[PDB]
Each structure stands twice: as structure tokens, then as C-alpha cells.
């Protein structure tokens, strides 16, 4: 659709820290684009509180059923639902283990912030999202990792990842400096699945590699390319 292409191009040119306002204004302007735009454009992550367990979790479309959101900690919807969408018993076991592992991953690499993992069954495997949010020192990092697992033994893993990052300083010499934007990348691999190399380990390694690669690329794009451009403006 020409209008969808145009809205997506708008979202690539408008200031990256205003995604929510720009998305909400676009949907106001062409309401029929709402569903397609929300499935194509990444939104900064929102934190909710699981008051039963006393833990924060992240909200996205993958843990939404109707107007409620499922906690990865309690496996319950807020507001409550009678028959909300749930992972199978087998996959809920993996999802608990994945939430615990990525909690630790997050602590070691981010020393703060909030993570959540949601898994869902597929025909010949399963898929999942790994979400990490760390606010700053003003700024915020949001990562969204969507992983698809086909089990053949050995499994095939497909990872699509988006990092959204903004940072702002206010200093005597440089005034106010704001850097904002995003990067999306994709990786694939086959890995052996065993008791010693389980899915969660294969997935963690793939997410780890992706975030390190993305961080390094952002570092040159943010602190390198835009720097060089400034130095040629004057």
C-alpha cells in the first residue's frame, strides 16, 4: 500500500525519540493503517508490575491477549482472564528457565534494567521474544529479540533483533547533545541441542552475539559517523 510505505518512510525520518508521539499521530491521521503500522514499527518497551510476585515485566504484543498482558513470573494475565493464551506446559517450563537465564544475562551486561521472555508453540518448534529495557546520565536502551526455533539432535535458529537507543548529555562545553536511533539485524545458525547445549544456551549465545555486534556497530554509527559529519559542517 502506498500510504503504508509513506508512513513507514515517515517513521524513518522523524526524530527517533518521539516514536510514540509520531506513531500515535500517524494512526490518528490514517486509522486504517493502525494494524499494519503497529506490526511493522518497533515501539519502545513499557514496564508493568506483577504485584503477586513483586517483579517488573515488559509489555509487548506477544504477551497480550485482548486488553490484558501475561506476566512471565506468575504466568497470569493482568487484568485477569478466564482462558488467556498460554504456552504449553512443556514450553512454560522452558520459558521459566529462559526468564531466569536472561535475568542473569541482563544483570551481567546491563547491571540494572528489566528483562522478560515469552515463548509460544509452533508446528515444528517454537518461537520467543527476549525483551530488555535499561534506562540511564540520561538515556534508554530497548532491545527486542524475536527467535524462531525449528527442531529437526540439531535445531535451526533464526533471530531478528532491534535495538533502540538514545542518550543525552548537558555539559558546559558541548551544551545539550542528544543521540537517538535504532538498528535491526538478523542472524541464522544450526546448533546441536543436547543436555549440555540446551535450547536456552543456544538462544542466549545467539542473543549475546547479536547485542555485542549491534552495540559495536552503534558505537561507530553514533560516536563515529555523526561525529565525522559534524566536523565537516564547519
Amino acid at each position: 500500500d502506498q500510504q503504508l510505505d509513506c508512513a513507514l518512510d515517515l517513521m524513518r525520518r522523524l526524530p527517533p525519540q518521539q516514536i510514540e508521539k509520531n506513531l500515535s499521530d500517524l494512526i490518528d491521521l490514517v486509522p486504517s493503517l493502525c494494524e499494519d503500522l503497529l506490526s511493522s514499527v518497533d515501539q519502545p518497551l513499557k514496564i508493568a508490575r506483577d504485584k503477586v510476585v513483586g517483579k517488573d515485566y515488559l509489555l509487548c504484543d506477544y504477551n497480550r491477549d485482548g486488553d490484558s498482558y501475561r506476566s512471565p513470573w506468575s504466568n497470569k494475565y493482568d487484568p485477569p482472564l478466564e482462558d488467556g493464551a498460554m504456552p504449553s506446559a512443556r514450553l512454560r517450563k522452558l520459558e521459566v528457565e529462559a526468564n531466569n537465564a536472561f535475568d542473569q544475562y541482563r544483570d551481567l551486561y546491563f547491571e540494572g534494567g528489566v528483562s522478560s521472555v515469552y515463548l509460544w508453540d509452533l508446528d515444528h518448534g517454537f518461537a520467543g521474544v527476549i525483551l530488555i529495557k535499561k534506562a540511564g546520565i540520561k538515556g534508554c536502551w530497548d532491545s527486542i529479540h524475536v527467535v524462531e526455533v525449528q527442531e529437526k539432535r540439531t535445531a535451526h535458529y533464526k533471530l531478528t533483533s532491534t535495538v533502540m537507543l538514545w542518550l543525552q548529555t548537558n555539559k558546559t562545553g558541548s551544551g545539550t547533545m542528544n543521540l537517538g536511533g535504532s538498528l535491526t539485524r538478523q542472524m541464522e545458525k544450526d546448533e546441536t541441542v543436547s543436555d549440555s547445549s540446551p535450547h536456552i544456551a543456544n538462544i542466549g549465545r545467539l542473543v549475546e552475539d547479536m547485542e555485542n555486534k549491534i552495540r559495536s556497530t552503534l558505537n561507530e554509527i553514533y560516536f563515529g559517523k555523526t561525529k565525522d559529519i559534524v566536523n565537516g559542517l564547519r
Binding site: 510514540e20 506513531l23 500515535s24 494512526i27 493502525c34 494494524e35 503497529l38 506490526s39 515501539q43 513499557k46 509489555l59 504484543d61 506477544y62 497480550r64 491477549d65 485482548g66 486488553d67 493464551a85 504456552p87 515469552y118 509460544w120 508453540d121 509452533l122 518461537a127 524475536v146 524462531e148 533464526k158 531478528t160
Partner: peptide, 15 residues
């Protein structure tokens, strides 16, 4: 991207 969870009702919406 793989499909999201099955059975999920409701349209996408802004938070």
C-alpha cells in the same frame, strides 16, 4: 519473523 502466539484475540494497540 515468525508468527506470534496463536489464538490471541484483539487488535494491536498503542500502550
Amino acid at each position: 519473523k515468525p508468527k506470534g502466539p496463536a489464538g490471541k484475540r484483539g487488535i494491536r494497540r498503542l500502550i
